[PDB]
Amino acid sequence: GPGSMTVVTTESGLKYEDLTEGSGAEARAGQTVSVHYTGWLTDGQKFDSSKDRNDPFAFVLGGGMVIKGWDEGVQGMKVGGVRRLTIPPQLGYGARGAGGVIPPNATLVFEVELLDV
Numbered sequence: 842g843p844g845s846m847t848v849v850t851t852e853s854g855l856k857y858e859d860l861t862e863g864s865g866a867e868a869r870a871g872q873t874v875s876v877h878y879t880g881w882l883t884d885g886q887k888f889d890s891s892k893d894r895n896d897p898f899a900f901v902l903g904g905g906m907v908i909k910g911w912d913e914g915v916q917g918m919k920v921g922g923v924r925r926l927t928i929p930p931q932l933g934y935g936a937r938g939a940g941g942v943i944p945p946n947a948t949l950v951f952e953v954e955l956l957d958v
């Protein structure tokens with residue numbers, strides 16, 4: 842009624858959460874799709890807001906211009922759907938990580954919102 846709430850991990854390691862069911866169409870491979878991305882720290886500190894550009898991030902799914910959690914996340918995400926994709930410190934920035942923005946060892950919380958495909 843009010844909504845669902847569950848967490849599940851994949852074999853790759855990445856994770857994702859349901860925020861808003863999308864009744865449109867799952868992202869296609871080899872095609873460009875516009876979606877909004879939001880980077881949040883372990884505490885909730887925002888370090889990236891696609892909304893800044895005032896437009897959806899249009900990128901080709903399965904091209905190589907994103908991270909594992911991205912390809913896998915969008916691969917399932919549907920138009921108008923919103924899911925919280927959780928990427929580890931290994932499948933994200935990398936062993937180096939950001940100077941002060943993001944720590945070396947920590948879970949990165951990224952929000953994905955499909956606007957169009």
Ligand SMILES: Cc1ccc(SCC(=O)N2CCCCC2)cc1
Pocket residue numbers: 878888889906907908911
């Ligand atoms: C603040 C900040 C500025 C530049 C970067 S690098 C962009 C990046 O690595 N992205 C991963 C795939 C989704 C789009 C963003 C990371 C953080």
